[PDB]
Amino acid sequence: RRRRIILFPVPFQGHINPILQLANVLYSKGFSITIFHTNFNKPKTSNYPHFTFRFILDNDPQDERISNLPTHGPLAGMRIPIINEHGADELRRELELLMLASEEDEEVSCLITDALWYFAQSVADSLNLRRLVLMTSSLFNFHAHVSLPQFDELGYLDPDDKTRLEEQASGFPMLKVKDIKSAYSNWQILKEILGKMIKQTKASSGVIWNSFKELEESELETVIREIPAPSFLIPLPKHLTASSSSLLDHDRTVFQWLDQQPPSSVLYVSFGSTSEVDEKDFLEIARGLVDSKQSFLWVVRPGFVKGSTWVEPLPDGFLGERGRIVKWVPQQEVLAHGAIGAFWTHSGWNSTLESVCEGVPMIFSDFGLDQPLNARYMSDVLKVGVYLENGWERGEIANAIRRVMVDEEGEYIRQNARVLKQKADVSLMKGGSSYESLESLVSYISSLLE
Numbered sequence: 102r103r104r105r106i107i108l109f110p111v112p113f114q115g116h117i118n119p120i121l122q123l124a125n126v127l128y129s130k131g132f133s134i135t136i137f138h139t140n141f142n143k144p145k146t147s148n149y150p151h152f153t154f155r156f157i158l159d160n161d162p163q164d165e166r167i168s169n170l171p172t173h174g175p176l177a178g179m180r181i182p183i184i185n186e187h188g189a190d191e192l193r194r195e196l197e198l199l200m201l202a203s204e205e206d207e208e209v210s211c212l213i214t215d216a217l218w219y220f221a222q223s224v225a226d227s228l229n230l231r232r233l234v235l236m237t238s239s240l241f242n243f244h245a246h247v248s249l250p251q252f253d254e255l256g257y258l259d260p261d262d263k264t265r266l267e268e269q270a271s272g273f274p275m276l277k278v279k280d281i282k283s284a285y286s287n288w289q290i291l292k293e294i295l296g297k298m299i300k301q302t303k304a305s306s307g308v309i310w311n312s313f314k315e316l317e318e319s320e321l322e323t324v325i326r327e328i329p330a331p332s333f334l335i336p337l338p339k340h341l342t343a344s345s346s347s348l349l350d351h352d353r354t355v356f357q358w359l360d361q362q363p364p365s366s367v368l369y370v371s372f373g374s375t376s377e378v379d380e381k382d383f384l385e386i387a388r389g390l391v392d393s394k395q396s397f398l399w400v401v402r403p404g405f406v407k408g409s410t411w412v413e414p415l416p417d418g419f420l421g422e423r424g425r426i427v428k429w430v431p432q433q434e435v436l437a438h439g440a441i442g443a444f445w446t447h448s449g450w451n452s453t454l455e456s457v458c459e460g461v462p463m464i465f466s467d468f469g470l471d472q473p474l475n476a477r478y479m480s481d482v483l484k485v486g487v488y489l490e491n492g493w494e495r496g497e498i499a500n501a502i503r504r505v506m507v508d509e510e511g512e513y514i515r516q517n518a519r520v521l522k523q524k525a526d527v528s529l530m531k532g533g534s535s536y537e538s539l540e541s542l543v544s545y546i547s548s549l550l551e
């Protein structure tokens with residue numbers, strides 16, 4: 102292969118999944134692929150015989166700043182600001198020694214990084230290497246990030262200012278003030294990171310969005326105005342699932358059980374790769390699921406429940422014939438199964454987009470960050486699910502589950518989910534928004550060394 106692309110993911114499941122989907126799509130279009138990855142949270146390189154992996158930044162002996170960071174729980178994310186602040190010299194060395202070792206017939210077209218690796222723009226510039234960015238969250242979230250100076254002036258980023266919570270955000274009516282308060286509760290850290298991510302995204306050679314035009318049409322004018330480089334909207338789950346980049350072992354025994362369920366009769370439940378609840382909330386969720394009287398498949402990550410290794414506070418036999426708990430599944434393959442009638446999600450963007458791409462309507466909870474904005478946009482603009490926006494109450498959980506899966510009152514939500522899947526499929530046909538985004542992206546990358 103004449104042309105090589107280097108990709109550099111953020112080493113968490115919601116970041117590795119889209120960049121290895123993109124890597125596969127670009128491999129399919131005839132590019133050779135090198136992945137730069139931390140040893141931390143590495144995927145199974147044996148699943149990618151067609152890719153070269155290079156492990157960087159946390160090789161032994163480890164830096165003072167990274168050596169003792171926890172490997173699980175939300176605190177593991179401290180690696181993101183630390184690598185941005187201290188990784189530039191090592192990334193430049195690794196890019197240089199790859200380009201020095203390269204064959205004379207092959208050249209590196211570009212570096213594609215996660216948008217959160219804002220430090221990589223200056224490194225790529227210093228080597229006369231073009232950098233493209235992969236956005237792993239929505240255009241709507243980007244629109245909110247660019248509006249932060251206005252949210253700040255209005256006092257929405259003040260945790261102590263508990264006024265106007267149920268009102269429409271001034272200058273941003275698609276959001277309630279409480280959505281902004283939730284999304285930016287970690288304002289001391291996010292203020293600096295998001296400003297840098299925006300500046301270095303605007304400075305990049307091109308922005309790839311894991312989305313499609315018909316999903317986020319209201320947000321296109323903002324990205325065309327804010328980002329001078331070309332934007333490409335490609336819905337990666339419509340190209341392939343992320344099964345090969347799983348960081349955990351799949352429980353595949355779930356498919357034999359799904360095959361025993363009537364069509365659209367199962368609630369799939371998963372609150373993410375990082376999320377945590379109190380025992381009080383975890384038992385309130387469990388009661389809501391039982392109160393619903395619907396069949397369910399619930400992925401609970403070890404550490405989801407504060408105080409327990411897994412699901413110890415749950416009684417044996419509880420959940421009935423109706424319910425299964427597992428540690429991990431191939432989630433998009435589960436969403437594609439005919440048994441699935443709905444998905445109770447934490448509203449992470451990969452989970453939200455996979456559900457949309459499989460036509461599965463949603464019940465939304467959130468654990469902050471971009472989650473409350475995804476839940477608000479999908480529930481109120483697209484109308485493909487119900488937002489549980491006032492915590493965990495067993496009655497409200499039961500009503501939301503029944504509304505989406507059974508109630509005639511919820512038929513419009515099930516129909517909206519069906520039609521949005523169809524729009525995603527049409528977007529991949531010749532002349533479709535996603536087809537044209539991908540053809541343009543391939544032509545654009547092929548032009549970078551002219």
Ligand SMILES: C=C1C[C@@]23CC[C@H]4[C@@](C)(CCC[C@@]4(C)C(=O)O)[C@@H]2CC[C@]1(O[C@@H]1O[C@H](CO)[C@@H](O)[C@H](O[C@@H]2O[C@H](CO)[C@@H](O)[C@H](O)[C@H]2O)[C@H]1O[C@@H]1O[C@H](CO)[C@@H](O)[C@H](O)[C@H]1O)C3
Pocket residue numbers: 113114115116175176177178179181182217237238242287290291294295375448449450451470471472
């Ligand atoms: C930018 C980030 C800096 C970061 C550093 C660590 C920090 C925390 C977690 C804040 C609390 C304190 C502290 C110290 C901590 O508890 O560790 C802080 C904010 C979110 C974070 O990125 C988040 O890091 C997590 C690992 O700890 C990832 O698992 C998240 O990815 C996942 O990525 C998915 C794909 O983007 C996303 O939909 C999903 O919700 C998310 O859970 C990713 O979400 C990012 O949050 C940003 C918040 O503004 C968004 O702009 C980005 O689009 C989004 O990707 C991690």
Ligand SMILES: O=c1ccn([C@@H]2O[C@H](COP(=O)(O)OP(=O)(O)O)[C@@H](O)[C@H]2O)c(=O)[nH]1
Pocket residue numbers: 114115116118343347371373374375376400428429430431432433448449450451452453455
């Ligand atoms: O049991 C599971 C649970 C989740 N996932 C995948 O983990 C990713 C989670 O990404 P998301 O953006 O939804 O949220 P995060 O977990 O990053 O907060 C998605 O690609 C899911 O399909 C999976 O494969 N199996």
